[PDB]
Design a protein around this nucleic acid. Sequence first.
RNA 1: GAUCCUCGGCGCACAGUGAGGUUACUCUCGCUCUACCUGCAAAGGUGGCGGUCGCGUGCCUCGUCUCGCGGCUGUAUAGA
Lengths: 365, 122
Amino acid sequence: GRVFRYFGDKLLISEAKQSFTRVGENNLTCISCFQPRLFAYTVSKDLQLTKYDITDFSKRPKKLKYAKGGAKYIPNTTEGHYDEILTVAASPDGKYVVTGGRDRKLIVWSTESLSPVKVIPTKDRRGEVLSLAFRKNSDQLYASCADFKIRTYSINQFSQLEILYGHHDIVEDISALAMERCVTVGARDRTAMLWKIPDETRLTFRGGDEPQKLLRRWMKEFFCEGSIDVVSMVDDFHFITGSDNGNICLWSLAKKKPIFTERIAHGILLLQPFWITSLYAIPYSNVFISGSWSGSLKVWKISDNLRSFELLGELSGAKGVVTKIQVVESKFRILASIAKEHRLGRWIANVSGARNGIYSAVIDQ
Amino acid sequence: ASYVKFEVPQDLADKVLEAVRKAKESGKIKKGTNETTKAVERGQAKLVIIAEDVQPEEIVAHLPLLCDEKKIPYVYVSSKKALGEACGLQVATASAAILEPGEAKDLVDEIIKRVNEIKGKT
RNA sequence: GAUCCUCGGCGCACAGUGAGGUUACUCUCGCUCUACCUGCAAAGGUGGCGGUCGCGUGCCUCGUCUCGCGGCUGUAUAGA
């Protein structure tokens, strides 16, 4: 279960085909893609869940069906959303799509009819759902929540399996592959945590390095980190994080500190760095994609020795706040949800080219 | 930002937000810039908490000046949404005040003494 | 110097707290027709073109494809 996909150098990024598709909704917060006919699912603060056919890389995402929630659904076990949907994940088997958000509910819908087949409450008055991730090739779902807990589920049992404890702030983002494990990030706790579910153990990785101290040890020959916001797993032994100081860090499970750091990865604009608001490592490959609100999607390549990563290129048609990135293949198709606002309501001054919809990029070789 | 007088490390910023929550529960707080103002003008406030992302900066700019006259310590946090949501509100707040710490006395006393150190003093 | 009281007439902007509450458009690009007629436009119908089944039907290759006919029918890849 390690990195074996080396197509980073092959990618024809400079000649990528770019498109954008407007939606009549406000503020996409997440996008989830299904891969065996390929599908995408989008959720919005406007309480809309939408399904797209994305199998034809020649044409933009084709809208198939939608379901909108609303005030009607105030109780929390009703089969509809009544507060901001923050996250969406498509089940690996093609049968289910599950949503969650500020109304402290998981709602699992059938992909067939886009109808709610099960509603599973978190049962906590602070348990907002912030992020979802299925274990790959499984029905096991992991939901990171705002009450500092990660909840696990068996989706074809429609039940809650257990609860994981460790974080000391909201668990903003969570990533999982094929193993029965997951990575989470705790925002202001400035930790990433690796949960080995069957071993009942957990690794803890710490950021939040004092700049004066960093400078002090750099003189042996920058920007304050206040939150680690995003995370993505590249293989069963490595992962990447993104912070609100622009840092993209590569971590190995064996090391306490990051094995590599690219500081202010999306630049600045006395000095303020662009946050990393999106991060997706395509599983077991040497490429990952990063997003902010700086107007482009940065594609990076990891070294074959896994000790560094480097800038492959930029996808510059991606104006707006990138809230989520997914990658599908047949040819790579990058899909990214673009909003005028940050998923969680963090305040963003002047977003250039603010807009609502889905960015697509098709890359060859 | 320019109305921010000194640098607050995130550990302290989190210990402040904590201090405020316990003070909602067990003591008395004031929430909002006007109410915080009155709390300083009246000398009731023990600690004043100012957000760093106020959007016209000048809205809270008077607080450092006012707190120094009345000799009430003040501290910064990075998010106004985070301070308000600490405060027991579902909306943002630009500044807040702790009037009686209750079950946070120990926690506050450590803050008013860390902000002294990273200010000068001894 | 006025008091103040009444009335009358004529105004009703000031005292504390704190997060509750409340998809559409615009612009570009292109985007199934066509002959005819019934027809003043418009509107209607026929034709085109296609596609459809039954069937016949041309191969020193008689596979498949060619071709047409009867029924009917109108539906392209689809969006940027």
